[PDB]
Each structure stands twice: as structure tokens, then as C-alpha cells.
Amino acid sequence: DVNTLTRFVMEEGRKARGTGELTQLLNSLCTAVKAISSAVRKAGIAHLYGIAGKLDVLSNDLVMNMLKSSFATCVLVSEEDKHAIIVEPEKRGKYVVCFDPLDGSSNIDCLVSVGTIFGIYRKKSTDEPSEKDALQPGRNLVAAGYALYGSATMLVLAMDCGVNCFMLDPAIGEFILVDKDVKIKKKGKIYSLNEGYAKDFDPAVTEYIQRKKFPPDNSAPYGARYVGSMVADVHRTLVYGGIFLYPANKKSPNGKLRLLYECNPMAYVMEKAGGMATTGKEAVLDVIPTDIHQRAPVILGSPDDVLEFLKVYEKHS
Amino acid sequence: DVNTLTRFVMEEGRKARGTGELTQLLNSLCTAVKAISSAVRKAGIAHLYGIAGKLDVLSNDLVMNMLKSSFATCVLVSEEDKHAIIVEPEKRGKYVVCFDPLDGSSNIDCLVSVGTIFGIYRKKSTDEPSEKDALQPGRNLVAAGYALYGSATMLVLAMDCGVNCFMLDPAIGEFILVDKDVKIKKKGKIYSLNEGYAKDFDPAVTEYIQRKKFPPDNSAPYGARYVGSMVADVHRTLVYGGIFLYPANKKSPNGKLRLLYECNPMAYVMEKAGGMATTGKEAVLDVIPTDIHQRAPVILGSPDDVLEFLKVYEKHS
Amino acid sequence: DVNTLTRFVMEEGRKARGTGELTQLLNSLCTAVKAISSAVRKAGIAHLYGIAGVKKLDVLSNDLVMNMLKSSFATCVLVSEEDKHAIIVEPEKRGKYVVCFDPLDGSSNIDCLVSVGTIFGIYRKKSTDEPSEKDALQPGRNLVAAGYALYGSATMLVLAMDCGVNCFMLDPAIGEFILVDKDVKIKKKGKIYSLNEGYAKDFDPAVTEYIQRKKFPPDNSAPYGARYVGSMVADVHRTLVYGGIFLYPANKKSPNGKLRLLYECNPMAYVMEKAGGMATTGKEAVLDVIPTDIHQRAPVILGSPDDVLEFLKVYEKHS
Amino acid sequence: DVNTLTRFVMEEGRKARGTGELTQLLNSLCTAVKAISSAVRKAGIAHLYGIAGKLDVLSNDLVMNMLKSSFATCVLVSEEDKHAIIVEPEKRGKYVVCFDPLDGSSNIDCLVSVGTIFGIYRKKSTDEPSEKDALQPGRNLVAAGYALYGSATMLVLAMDCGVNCFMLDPAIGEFILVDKDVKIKKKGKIYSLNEGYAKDFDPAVTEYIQRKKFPPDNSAPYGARYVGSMVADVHRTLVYGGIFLYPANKKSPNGKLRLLYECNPMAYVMEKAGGMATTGKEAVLDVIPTDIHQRAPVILGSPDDVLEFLKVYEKHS
Ligand SMILES: COCCc1sc(S(=O)(=O)NC(=O)Nc2cc(Br)cc(N3CCOCC3)n2)cc1C
Ligand SMILES: COCCc1sc(S(=O)(=O)NC(=O)Nc2cc(Br)cc(N3CCOCC3)n2)cc1C
Ligand SMILES: COCCc1sc(S(=O)(=O)NC(=O)Nc2cc(Br)cc(N3CCOCC3)n2)cc1C
Ligand SMILES: COCCc1sc(S(=O)(=O)NC(=O)Nc2cc(Br)cc(N3CCOCC3)n2)cc1C
């Protein structure tokens, strides 16, 4: 039986018999994702170059405006905005959304994969809405996922029921369900990190990476892949198995990836698909944030690969 | 003034006062690339999943059929075909085309960027067309380039006039001229290779990559990027500068990449854009091939970076 | 504030506190309309003509609407211009709604790239008996929702419900139906009549005199213009947008008209009246005819209220 | 073998051994039509309605700007411009183009089919170009045709070699050759005109239409179709056979349609397809214009049906 993103959410939304705000939120998010994909693929670029005589800004504006107008959100945290956006009272709903509207777009000059990352919370305090409402642990996520604008445009959605993948058919502008209840391999064969920071690695990371290239059990060495765009890297890990690392280094002593709208949604997806996501010291999903743009070190992926790293991490205290 | 690929090629053909076969060839290849792109982006996937009731093969068939029906070709070498394809006599034209119809498609399941690589040679003799007509060194190339099916679709075309980049506007199916006569940085800050096989590196490769991570002076260590799809990694090298390595080692004395439809067209693009491309022992374009599928090692990118590799390469010779 | 078909239906559905089957029905129908649109605009035809080396459009349209409706879990009986008998949804997929639809109206002239369209009307199931074809023999008055997709110069979905008529433009760049005309109402009186005057030799006397009055007005006013696309969805949408009258009247050779009551006349009569217009068979309201055959025909005269009344004045003059 | 608009034109130009200007002309117009098609189908209308926060004017600008930049034209006559546009000197070529960029657009609110019509003349003298270059009889046409934005988008091109029909494949942005060397039926079964203006008909039109509803020889009456969009009605006459009339009456002694960029290109398309096109008194292509916007009555279509009209016209002298 064919399924679309909209029918899938609505059917899951009917079973839960909730208020319907989460469905309008996700439906609006889906529309923004299609608009972003169309602009990322350069639809209408001929008009910019004079056939008749900024991208991350457009993406943020698309997501901001579809979310505000859904009547489903109250607080919006974006990589593009310094402060949280408080939805005006007539459009206020009960959900908090943290999102990177176009992650990896700093390198978009080379047509590298980019993506949108999002995490959805139910507002937790009864106070008037403020930035504090987005400072929740990832354990509290109601919904999370990403759209990868890669060779094709895919939407990965994780909820309590698990992880589902939707391929965007651009001929009809519909998200088609193609991979139901996806689960990551117990053990992968690809590790993913920027080895250029090798001079600033902590000893556990140095030793773990050494074990991937020169296995102590004479097994096959892992291959390395690092796209430099987090959505593309995490999606490859989920589909192929393996491990993704962005640990702390000298230029980024608290890590580089953002906890609210990069690490937590990926940690959410990883855990619902049977993977792991750790900072080294604790679960990514267990970090309680204090700042909306705060950074975190992150190691995620197939459980055997993350546990093997934690085993090495504990060797170094 | 707005410019498209089709208007552009024709204007180059009129200046050159050629027979027009090469213009018909490039226009045919452009139509194939637009068809491949539509398929990579999953147009019509809704019909596959039962809404109303092969990707490397199709790419090959699109290029093959558009090339044969251009009346501009006589011999076709494909990554997908064991022997060269001899165009039937009624359709024979004067050019020889080597191509990879969908490079990177082994990992297309994770929606990594893929691409089409192509190199166009003039047939050299009036003898009956045969595979021997493809055994020319890359130096004899009349035209070469690639299509990157990335976050957007771009066609990079190199001729005697230089390297030009065309963006595909999917709204109108036209390739828009966006980067004229592009030149690679004299020196970059990114190195690209699969570091997972460090256990099998040539010792010279080991020392070179160590220098990128641990510079003996006070310069910045390079960042690492490796998509694992050649078109994307080389295109990132062209736009940003840096170095791309798929080198020879002991276990693979000739490298892994294919010379005719991976190494040569890219080596040609690099050199017309002011880069360098070497096997370690000689320039890629100078290798005389003896097998249409023979492998070659390739190291290309910014010239200062390739020369630094050659300096390390000679230290171990 | 931007609004979409999906957003619009869902919040209207939330207000009503209904079961949600109607929204999943409408959302599925939206998906079929976009897939039909893609095929009508000839997406992928290069492959038909051998770019690398399959089914007729009205067959594909029927399969798209049929399959999207069945898989919505919202329908029980489906009546199609393409199928002799009503289709009874299998039990595991059954919902409480009856949908009559024309999957691709006007396709007789699709070789000339004429405007084509999809027509649809949605009913509620009335009895607790096992679902059967007679559940589709309800009068148009019983319509829960009705509308059409017009595949013209652009693709528009016109949706009529109790809250009124709303028009949605398909933006193909993002595959979204954009609300562009809220609460549409037809002009009180128009300047265009629509019918096939080539068959005037077989006209009933009332139609002949009414068309005579349109070309040679007895009050020496300006004559109406004539437009006839020959594609029903295009002609009726022009009537709604510009005003005037659309006629497919009964004659001696076709005393019950030629258009089909369930999936052409009833949905169009529903849209017209929700937009403040009229639609009559000559003898009665289109929406009041109680059908006895799912493919039974009805004559139809619709459009602006003053133009239909002027027709009816002529109709009664001829008994 | 598959054929495209671009490949088809190029092969015709090679056979003729021309300067290439006419090929560069047609290729630019082909791109303008694809851009018009995209806007007509309402690409990007969501951005007009605030998803992130005229049409014939745009169409004129697209045609004007693609033709100017083709370097193949010197004089442009448009339904949208009162005076002819004289191409700037660096961009001047030897061809004169008359075009209606978006015909039927007054009724575009009801989504009636619309279209672009064009006729191409060679220039008249080496003197500095002027509007006088557009005052040619239709007989002097080098090429003419139309794009119909109907249920799908089709381009009909007429040259000395005949009439060919090209379908726009919107998934790849190519015009695919679908109807080669089309020939109109000798006799049709549909007549097309605005019967609402019957009070002012000349007796010949009155008597001819009478013959279509009430055949004196016991034949079947013709059907009536009138869309109100000239490209749509004329395309139907070509595809199904029959007759289209926008004739002269007392209030419009020269008709309503414009001779240079509505009547003449259609008469040329008709005559190259074996049909006829008359004003009643003479063949449309034989009218020598004295004003670029002068009107002409037109009756075109299947030859038996036009000849039938003419004898009714001559019966009334
Ligand atoms: C982890 O949880 C994720 C699961 C959830 S819950 C939500 S929700 O909160 O938006 N709820 C609803 O959309 N509900 C809903 C929707 C429709 Br259609 C009909 C009805 N019914 C009307 C008749 O009476 C019964 C309820 N309800 C979305 C998702 C994906
Ligand atoms: C090393 O740079 C190669 C550059 C080249 S050459 C070719 S080509 O081989 O296809 N040739 C032509 O397209 N020729 C051509 C085209 C047109 Br339109 C008109 C004329 N005419 C000759 C002059 O008189 C008028 C007619 N010629 C393609 C490219 C990209
Ligand atoms: C004919 O025009 C009538 C208008 C109607 S009614 C229907 S419906 O029947 O499909 N029902 C619903 O859509 N219901 C619905 C949907 C969502 Br989301 C949430 C909730 N609620 C959850 C919270 O608790 C209350 C119910 N309900 C569709 C239309 C367009
Ligand atoms: C009105 O129907 C006439 C048909 C015509 S003529 C023209 S044209 O005027 O633009 N000319 C050319 O396109 N010429 C041309 C094009 C190419 Br590619 C190569 C060469 N070569 C020069 C000769 O040696 C071989 C190479 N020439 C277009 C059309 C469609």
C-alpha cells in the first residue's frame, strides 16, 4: 500500500487522538522542505542571471513563516537567528521547534549535499513563552528528523513509533514512504570525521581512529568518508552503518556542532533507529542545555562502533 | 547577457567554423544529462511504489542512445560496457567518446552526490572504427567534463577556451552559464583521499598526509574532505582549491580509478583550469593507454599542492 | 498569510470535530490530482519516444484516483465514468464515504491539447447494509463536498463544501495547492453562453429561441459572446469565473441530456449553487434528481442566476 | 530515433549551410517558450502568496531579451509594443521577428489555453534597420509557428521543409519531436467562430455557417468549438481538421486579428501543412501590410472547407 508523508502523519495522528497541532506543524514543515529543495536545486536561477532582463536566509524565512502560520508553535530556535523567536499570541501553539534551516550550506559553493534539521518539543513550562522553553533535554523530543537535499531529496522522520524515510517525488511534489521503521546495523565499516584536526585530538579519539586503520584483530580496516556536511554524513551512517565523530578540539573546546538543532535531532533519530549518540561522557539526549546556540562534541552511529569508542574512552579515564 | 550551454557551444562552433558534429554531440550529451538528473532526483518514484496500482543502466542507455543518434560518434567506451561500442555505419560520426554514465552510483543508496564524466576525442585514422580508436592519451582530448548531480545540477565543460560551469535550472531545462573560464587556486587547504586504507599507503603518501595534519612550520593543518564520489570530490577541489588523491600503492600498483573515463577527463579539466594531474611518475594526460578499462593513479588539484606531493614522491623514489 | 489545500481542509475538519476520514479522503484526492497533472503535462514523454531506447491517460487517471481513494481507508463505494459497475472497497480498507468521479473529463479531445479535468462529488453512506451500488444513488443535495481539477494553462483545484467554494492553484515547483480565491461567488448576470451550436438542427424549441435571443436581443442590447471549449470542466470554470450560462440541454434525440448525473452534473451543480449560481435540468434542480442508474444522464443548464432564469422563462413559454 | 527541437533545427541548418543565425534564433526562442511555459503553469506562485513572508509583460520581456541576445535579429514587432524594437548594434543580426508573446491572455483568469505566435522574415536591405523591415507579406516567411500552453505544452514549427510538432517534456526541459511533417485533413467536421456576433455577419459567413448546421445535401452537421484563444482553436483545426473563422463584418472591415504576428504565422503554418488561409478576397500571405499592427480577417483550415467558404463568398460577389 502506497503511503505519503501527509497520510502517514495523519494516520499516526488519528491513532494518538491528539489535538491535531502536531500534524499541522509537520505538514507545514513538509511544505517548507519542498520549497527549500526547489531553491537548493536552483529552480528559477535562470531569472537571477537575466533571462528576462541568500539561500540560508530564504530557507530560514520559509521554515519560520510556515511554522508561525501553522498555529502550532510558540517558540522558534534557528541557527540563523541570535535569539529565540517568540510566536505572536494569535498564532501561538504548544510546540517548540529547534531547526537548522540549511545545514552544511557554508560549503554550498561546491554543490555539496545540504539539509534541514529539526527537533520538536511540547512546551514544558506554564510560564509565558521564552527562550527557556527550548532549553530541554533531547529525551523530551516529540518529533525530530531531517531533509537531505542530496542526489535526491529525502525526509527522515523519527517519532515514538520509530524512524521512517520519505523520498520526495518532484514530479508531483509528494513525499513517498520508501523505508519503513528503519534500523541501523549493529556494526558498520565506515568511520566519519575530519582527520585534519588530528593534531588536537584527545588520546581516546586518536587511539580509536588508530584501531580503525590498523585493526588489532587483523580484521579489515574501515573506510573513511567525510562529506563535511552533517546531514549527508549522518544519513550515510544510518543507511550504511558505521560511526560519525565530531569530537572537541582546540578551536572548539565544547565541540562544534550545535546541541539544540544539530546534535539532539540526530541523537533522537539514532536512538529510535537502534543506534547510539554520546558526547563521550553522557548520552547526547541527556545533556540539559543552558544556551540555545551552545555546542557539543558528538559521536554517534551503529551501537557496536559507539560502544567500542566508549570502551576506549574509559581506558583514558 | 544571459548565456546557456546550447547558445554557448554554438558560438564556439561558429568561431571555430567546424563541421557542426561536435556541437550536435554536446547538445545530445546535455539532453542526456538533463534526463539522468531527473532520474537521479527520483522523478516518478511515486509510480514505482504503487500509487497507480537500474539507475546506472538507464544513465548508460541515455548517453548511448543520445550519442548514437547525434550522428557525431563512431566509437563509444563506457564504464558499463566490457568492449567498446562501434556505432552502426548509418549513424557514424567523427568523434570518440569515453564516459562514466553515473559515477559514484555504488553508494547512491545514501543519496551521496553522483555524476557523469565524459571525454571527447577526435578519431585519428580513416581505418574502420574499432576499440583501438579509444587508445589515445588524454592530451588528444577535444572536450571533457562532468555533470555533478549534487545539491544542484551543474555541467562543467573544458575545451581549448578553458573551463566553464553551467547550472541546470530544472524549471526550464536549460544550463545557465554561471562561472566563466574558472581557474583553480594556486594552493588549497583541503586534502581528499580515503584515509581508511592508511595501512596500505605508499610510504610517500603516508609522509605527505602527515605533513597536512602536522605541518613542520606554524601553518594551519589542512582540513579533510572525502565524499567517496569522484565528481563531487574533484569538483570541490576545482572550486575551493586543494588536492585529490587516489594514488598507487603496493597492492594496487596502477591505482584504482579508470584512466579513460575518470582520470583523463578530470585531468583535462584541472589542467585547462590551471591545475595539475599526475600519476606520481608522469602527467595523467601523457599516459598512452593499452586497455580501454586500464587503471591509473591520479593526484590532481591546486598546482602548489601537487608539486609538494611530487616533492615527497621523489624522496621515496 | 499563506494557505494551502492541506492546511485548509485540516483546519475546517478540526472545527467540525469529524472522524478524519473526510480529510484523509480529500488529501488522497489531492495526491491523485497532482499525479494526473504531471502526466497530462506530458512528464516523461521523452521516454515514450525513445530517449533511452506506457498506459493511456484516462486509464492512468482512473487508476490514480481509484488507488488513492481505496488506500485512504475513507471510502466504501467508488463510481467512475470508466467503470460499468460501482467498485466496493475491500473490507480492510473501508470507510463511510461514497465518491463519484470522472477521472479525466474532456479527454476525447486530448490529442489537440484541449483543457481537461477531473470532476468529483463526495457523499456520506446512509444505511448500515453492506455497501452496494445503490449507496451511490443519492441526490446531489446530499453532497458532503464536491469540486473539480482543471488541467488548463495552469492546474487549479476548485473545492466546494458547505462553507462555500475555494480555488487552489497548483504550484508545480513545490507540489502544493495554493489558496488563491476564497469564497468565490458567480456574477449575477453574464455576457457569455456556452453550448454546441453545430447541433442546432436538433434543438428543442426553447433552446433555439433562447440562443436566438442571445444573438438578436429583443431589447436591442449588446449580444452575448459565444465560447464553447467542448471540454466540460473548462467551460464550467469559465462560467464560474466570468459569469454567463453553460448549456447541455435535452433534445428530441436525447430526452435525458447527454452528460452524466452522478460525476459530471451533480458536482458542477453543487459548485454553482455554493457560489450562488443555478443549475437546472429544465424541469427540476439538478441537485434534486433522484438517480436510479449510476451512469444515468441528465440535461444541465448552469451559470449566473439571471441568465438561467431568462432561459427558464423561455423554457416555460414552450411548456 | 528520438529527435529534439534543438537537434532538429541544427540538422536543417547544416543541410542549408546558412550562417547559423536562424539556428541561434530558434534556439533562443525555444528557451523563451520554456520560460513562458513555466510561468504560465504558475511556477513559484507560492512565493507570490507569501510562503516565505503581468504575465504577458513577463512573456514579452522573455521573448525580447532572448531574441536580442541571440545576435540573429535586428527588428522586433510585438503585440505588446506600439513601435518596433530596433536591436542594439552590437547584437544585430539579419532576421526580423514578429511575435505575439502571450496570445489569449485577456481570458487567462479562467485558465484558458494561451500561446506564443511568431513569424521570422529575412531582413530587406543593408540600410540601417527600420520598421519598414517588418512590412513584408507573409509569403516572405523563412519560418513561423506557435507554442500552445494547453493541457500540455507543444511547439509547432513551420519551415520550407514543412510543419513539425514538438512536445515539451517538463521533467527534462526538452522539446521532443512527436508529429513529423504534419498534414491537415483535406476536409474536417468542426467549424470554429464566435457565433455570438451573428447580428453583424456578412451574408457569406451567415450562409456558410447555415450550411454547417443545416447541410443541404443530407450530410451530418459539423460540430462547433470555439475556445476564444487563437492558438488553441488553430491547433485544433490543424489536429482534427475543419475551419476557423474570424471574418470581416461591417463593424470590422479588416477583421480583428493582427496580420504580422497572428494571421501571417498561422497562414504559413496552414499552407505548409497543406491547408488554406484566406481573408475572403485574397490569400493571407499575399496581403502587403502598411502598418505593423494592421488587422486582417482570416479563414483558415482544411482545403475543402475553405474552398467551400470561398464559393459562398463569390456567390455574393
Ligand atoms: C509521538 O506521537 C506522535 C503521533 C502524533 S499525535 C499527532 S496530533 O497531536 O497532531 N493529533 C492528531 O493529529 N489527531 C487527530 C488527527 C485527525 Br485527521 C483526526 C483525529 N481525531 C478526530 C476524531 O476524534 C479522534 C481524533 N485526531 C500527530 C502525530 C504524528
Ligand atoms: C577547439 O574549439 C572547439 C570549439 C567547437 S568547434 C565545434 S563544431 O565542430 O561543432 N563546429 C560548428 O559547430 N560549426 C558551426 C556552427 C554553426 Br551554428 C555555424 C557554422 N558555420 C561555419 C561558418 O559559416 C557559417 C556556418 N559552423 C563545436 C565546438 C564547441
Ligand atoms: C464537509 O465539510 C466539513 C468539514 C470537514 S469534517 C472533516 S473530517 O470528518 O475528516 N474530520 C476531521 O478532519 N477531524 C479532525 C482532524 C484533526 Br487534524 C483533528 C481533529 N480533532 C482532534 C482533537 O479532537 C477533536 C477532533 N479532528 C474534514 C472536513 C474538511
Ligand atoms: C528556413 O529553413 C532553413 C533551414 C535552416 S537554415 C539555418 S541557418 O541559416 O541558421 N544555418 C545554419 O544553421 N548553418 C550551419 C549550422 C551548423 Br550546426 C553547421 C554549419 N556548417 C557550415 C557549413 O559546413 C558545415 C558546418 N552550418 C537554420 C535552419 C533550421
mmCIF file with all atom_site columns, C-alpha atoms in Angstrom, chain D residues 15 24 66 69 72 83 85 106 124 133 135 137 151 180 182 192 200 205 208 227 244 273 291 294:
data_model
loop_
_atom_site.group_PDB
_atom_site.id
_atom_site.type_symbol
_atom_site.label_atom_id
_atom_site.label_alt_id
_atom_site.label_comp_id
_atom_site.label_asym_id
_atom_site.label_entity_id
_atom_site.label_seq_id
_atom_site.pdbx_PDB_ins_code
_atom_site.Cartn_x
_atom_site.Cartn_y
_atom_site.Cartn_z
_atom_site.occupancy
_atom_site.B_iso_or_equiv
_atom_site.pdbx_formal_charge
_atom_site.auth_seq_id
_atom_site.auth_comp_id
_atom_site.auth_asym_id
_atom_site.auth_atom_id
_atom_site.pdbx_PDB_model_num
ATOM 1  C CA . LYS D 1 15  ? 21.815  20.917 -44.763 1.00 0.00 ? 15  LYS D CA 1
ATOM 2  C CA . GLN D 1 24  ? 20.667  30.668 -32.880 1.00 0.00 ? 24  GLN D CA 1
ATOM 3  C CA . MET D 1 66  ? 16.252  36.110 -25.720 1.00 0.00 ? 66  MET D CA 1
ATOM 4  C CA . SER D 1 69  ? 20.838  38.334 -27.113 1.00 0.00 ? 69  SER D CA 1
ATOM 5  C CA . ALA D 1 72  ? 20.400  36.999 -35.021 1.00 0.00 ? 72  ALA D CA 1
ATOM 6  C CA . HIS D 1 83  ? 6.649   50.719 -32.230 1.00 0.00 ? 83  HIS D CA 1
ATOM 7  C CA . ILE D 1 85  ? 12.127  47.376 -31.326 1.00 0.00 ? 85  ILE D CA 1
ATOM 8  C CA . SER D 1 106 ? -7.126  38.605 -21.701 1.00 0.00 ? 106 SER D CA 1
ATOM 9  C CA . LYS D 1 124 ? 15.169  43.703 -46.522 1.00 0.00 ? 124 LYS D CA 1
ATOM 10 C CA . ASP D 1 133 ? 11.675  45.631 -42.484 1.00 0.00 ? 133 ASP D CA 1
ATOM 11 C CA . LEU D 1 135 ? 6.239   45.395 -43.617 1.00 0.00 ? 135 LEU D CA 1
ATOM 12 C CA . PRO D 1 137 ? 3.857   39.850 -46.993 1.00 0.00 ? 137 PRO D CA 1
ATOM 13 C CA . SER D 1 151 ? -3.231  20.738 -21.353 1.00 0.00 ? 151 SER D CA 1
ATOM 14 C CA . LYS D 1 180 ? 6.661   14.835 -38.193 1.00 0.00 ? 180 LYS D CA 1
ATOM 15 C CA . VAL D 1 182 ? 2.133   17.072 -40.350 1.00 0.00 ? 182 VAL D CA 1
ATOM 16 C CA . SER D 1 192 ? -14.829 27.444 -35.151 1.00 0.00 ? 192 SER D CA 1
ATOM 17 C CA . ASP D 1 200 ? -23.124 41.630 -37.890 1.00 0.00 ? 200 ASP D CA 1
ATOM 18 C CA . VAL D 1 205 ? -20.420 33.850 -43.289 1.00 0.00 ? 205 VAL D CA 1
ATOM 19 C CA . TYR D 1 208 ? -21.694 29.279 -44.871 1.00 0.00 ? 208 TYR D CA 1
ATOM 20 C CA . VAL D 1 227 ? -12.161 28.332 -27.197 1.00 0.00 ? 227 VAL D CA 1
ATOM 21 C CA . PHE D 1 244 ? -11.564 28.524 -38.129 1.00 0.00 ? 244 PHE D CA 1
ATOM 22 C CA . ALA D 1 273 ? 0.564   21.734 -43.723 1.00 0.00 ? 273 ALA D CA 1
ATOM 23 C CA . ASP D 1 291 ? 1.226   49.117 -40.524 1.00 0.00 ? 291 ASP D CA 1
ATOM 24 C CA . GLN D 1 294 ? -2.900  46.342 -39.048 1.00 0.00 ? 294 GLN D CA 1
#
